[PDB]
Ligand binder design. Structure first.
Ligand SMILES: CSC[C@H](NC(=O)COc1cccc2cnccc12)C(=O)N[C@@H](Cc1ccccc1)[C@H](O)C(=O)N1CSC(C)(C)[C@H]1C(=O)N[C@H]1c2ccccc2C[C@H]1O
Lengths: 99, 99
């Protein structure tokens, strides 16, 4: 698909058996999701951007489905204002910028 | 061009006759640049990101080249961690997400 940028590029994702809305974000190194349960071990991480840093839990080898494309990667969970799909998963679904 | 996302999508921009590096950021509504001098009057704006909100100065109708493509539009100036080209200008240069 081709997604224009007149509005926020929001998509439905499936993660941890839950459906969520998330933003396809080429400015994010990592993927961060609002508070939810995920399986496995985690470790704490700080992530920073406009407004400063927040603390999140880092879960590895999590499967997500993003617009019908399956991928696996690290997912961070914490008090993000918006669910964000970052480059670590955008690459896996073959997402590129084109102009 | 087509820009893949295995690395940060950093590009060269030209603003105020000077070259700077900036990030193509589909997660950003607006374009925000580190402190610099821009002509004309500015208005106040608050923008919020992953760590909270910051105050910036809004300049309208600013000439800016992004990867050699000419745009003219709103540029915010303030304490951003990285120069960010947001959707207001990514649309001007005809940028889309594709997968
Ligand atoms: C014009 S700058 C402000 C911009 N915000 C927006 O466009 C819209 O914000 C909002 C929309 C809706 C509700 C909100 C509620 N509270 C606050 C903001 C809200 C923004 O910062 N967008 C960021 C994404 C975001 C969207 C909505 C809420 C919060 C964040 C941006 O696309 C990004 O990733 N940025 C801007 S600064 C940056 C470093 C280039 C990068 C970043 O934070 N990256 C970090 C990140 C993000 C997520 C996961 C990991 C990491 C590491 C690091 O890579």
């Amino acid at each position: 698909p081709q997604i224009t940028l007149w509005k926020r590029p929001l998509v439905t994702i499936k993660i941890g058996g839950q459906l969520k809305e998330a933003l396809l974000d080429t400015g994010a190194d990592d993927t961060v999701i609002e508070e939810m349960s995920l399986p496995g071990r985690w470790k704490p991480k700080m992530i920073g951007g406009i407004g400063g840093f927040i603390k999140v839990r880092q879960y590895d080898q999590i499967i997500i489905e993003i617009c019908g494309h399956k991928a696996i990667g690290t997912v961070l969970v914490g008090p993000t204002p918006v669910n964000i799909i970052g480059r670590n998963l955008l690459t896996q679904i073959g997402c590129t910028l084109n102009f």
